[PDB]
Amino acid sequence: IVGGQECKDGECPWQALLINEENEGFCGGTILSEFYILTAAHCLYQAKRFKVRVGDRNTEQEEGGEAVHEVEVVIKHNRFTKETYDFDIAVLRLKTPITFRMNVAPACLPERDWAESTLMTQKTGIVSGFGRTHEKGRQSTRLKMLEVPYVDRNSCKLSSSFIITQNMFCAGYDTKQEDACQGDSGGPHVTRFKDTYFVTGIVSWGEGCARKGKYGIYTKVTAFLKWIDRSMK
Amino acid sequence: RKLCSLDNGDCDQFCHEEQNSVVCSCARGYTLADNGKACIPTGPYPCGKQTL
Ligand SMILES: O=C1[C@@H](NS(=O)(=O)c2ccc3cc(Cl)ccc3c2)CCN1c1ccc([C@H]2CCCN2)cc1F
Ligand SMILES: [Ca+2]
Ligand SMILES: [Mg+2]
């Protein structure tokens, strides 16, 4: 995350971190329930074997609430292609259930029609992760969040060098230096409605980070609600 | 602005229009309150709530 703020105690409890053999985060995820994590399909090629960490806000210390979970089942969208980044979604079933607590809680899955009419029409959403804090830099040791305006679909298509499919949406800023970045992929985009946060996107891709005239591109969760529901059953 | 377009039908969460009236509902882990509008958590860690 470029710009934005630290996630303070209990503020981003649905954040999950995918960690490789070396115990380093390489992608984010969203806690959906005690057994399930939402992530980006493209993250599944960035590590041969990986686990999921929850409850972490600082990769340098032990806060007492961190928990590592092994993955039992990886459910990747079969239509995902590296070429277009379309269908950039995957669900992970964990071997053991997540114990909810301070800094560990699921984000709500909304209903489609309502999410599209009421959540996606809000001014902003919130993106979070342990990703780079500058286009060129190392992964953040601290969990960060950033308020990102929803971007008009027309403006986003005009701004993009590549096709923005109906499974994608844009959020962020035209010129202001704030955006998601490398390592934030797969992480949560949530939208607040009456103090309840609903998952609305998956950090997917961007032409660099916080570039002028470019926005962050997210998987449109509302397009996959049935698929997610089936994957969880 | 009418029904669900009028301040979300006064629903805490999901708003649907059945017939010509508002029907509220909630995400899993919540129960619809007796007033048929508010959503009440069933446990200490309901989805979408910061743990503050
Ligand atoms: O995601 C990134 C960039 N990597 S990043 O690590 O800086 C990054 C990663 C994820 C981001 C997510 C958001 Cl929301 C914002 C910035 C990001 C920046 C570099 C270029 N890139 C990228 C990936 C896939 C595509 C495909 C689509 C059609 C054709 N190919 C296009 C891209 F530009
Ligand atoms: Ca820690
Ligand atoms: Mg920009």
**Whether A74 contacts A44, CB under 8 Å:** yes
Q: Note the maximum CA span of chain A.
A: 46
φ and ψ at residue A223, rounded to 5 degrees: -75, -10
Q: Would you call B14 helix, strand, or coil by DSSP? A: strand
Q: What span, in angstroms and rounded, lies between the C-alpha atoms of B50 and A103?
A: 8
Alpha-carbon radius of gyration of chain B:
12
Decide: A84 in ligand 1 pocket, CB within 6 A. yes
Per DSSP, the three-state class of A230 is helix
Q: Does the beta-carbon distance from A197 to B49 stay under 8 Å?
A: yes
**Measured between alpha carbons, how far is A231 from A75 in angstroms, rounded to an integer?**
7
Q: Answer for the pair B49, B41: CB distance below 8 angstroms, yes or no.
A: yes
Q: In terms of CATH, what superfamily is A13-106+223-233? A: Trypsin-like serine proteases (2.40.10.10)
The candidate with the shortest Cα–Cα distance to A70, out of A45, A100, A97, is A97
Identity at A26, one-letter amino acid code: F
SS3 A51: strand
Residue ranges covered by each domain of chain A: 1-12+107-222, 13-106+223-233
Of A101, A102, A111, the CB nearest to B14: A111
Give the domain extent around B13.
Answer: 1-52
Q: Between vectors from CA A83 to CA A227 and to CA A158, what angle results, nearest 5°?
A: 90
Neighbours of B21 (CB within 10 A): 10
Structure tokens at A196: 């309840």
In ligand 1, the atom with minimum distance to the C-alpha of A179 is 15
What DSSP assignment string belongs to A164-188? --TTEEEES-SSSS-B--TT-TT-E
Q: Which residue of A has its CA nearest to B29?
A: A108
Exposure class string for A20-52: b at 16+ Cβ within 10 A, else e: eeeeebbbbbbbbbebbbbbbbbbbeebeebbb
Supply the DSSP symbol for A58.
Answer: B
The one-character DSSP state at A8 is -
Q: Whose CA is nearest to atom 29 of ligand 1?
A: A84
Q: Are domains A1-12+107-222 and A13-106+223-233 of this chain identical in fold?
A: yes
Q: Tell me the catalytic residues of A.
A: 42, 88, 185
Tell whether B16 lies on the interface with A, counting CB pairs under 8 A. yes
Tell me, letter by letter, the H, E, C secondary structure of A125-138. Answer: EEEEECCECCCCCC
Residues β-bridged to residue A18:
A27, A52
- Ligand 1: which atom is nearest the Cα of residue A208? 7
Residue A186 CA to residue A131 CA, distance in Å, equals 11
Please state, in angstroms and rounded to a whole number, the distance separating the CA atoms of residues A176 and A214: 10
* H helix intervals, A110-162: 112-114, 153-159
Nearest residue on chain B to A190, judged by CA atoms?
B48
Binding site membership of A206 for ligand 1 (Cβ less than 6 Å): yes
- Which chain A residues touch B28 with a CB distance below 8 Å? 108-109
Residue B12 near chain A (CB below 8 Å): yes
Among A111, A118, A197, the residue with its CB nearest the CB of B48 is: A197
Closest-CA residue to A54 (of A108, A84, A92): A92
Yes or no: say if A161 and A206 are a contact pair by the CB < 8 Å rule.
Answer: no
Neighbours of A192 (CB within 10 A): 17
Determination technique for this PDB entry?
X-ray
Is some CB atom of chain A closer than 8 A to the CB atom of B32? no
Alpha-carbon Rg for chain A, nearest whole angstrom, is 16
A87: nearest Cα among A32, A127, A46, A40: A40
Q: Which ligand 1 atom is nearest residue A162's CA? A: 28
Query: What CATH topology corresponds to A1-12+107-222?
Result: Thrombin, subunit H (2.40.10)
Q: Identify the CATH number of the domain in which residue B27 sits.
A: 2.10.25.10
End-to-end alpha-carbon separation of chain A, Å?
A: 33
Chain A hits for B51, Cβ within 8 Å: 10, 13, 101-105
Edge-to-edge strand ranges of the sheet holding A5-6 = A5-6, A144-149, A124-129, A188-193, A196-205, A216-220, A168-171
Nearest CB to B49: which of A103, A105, A110?
Answer: A105
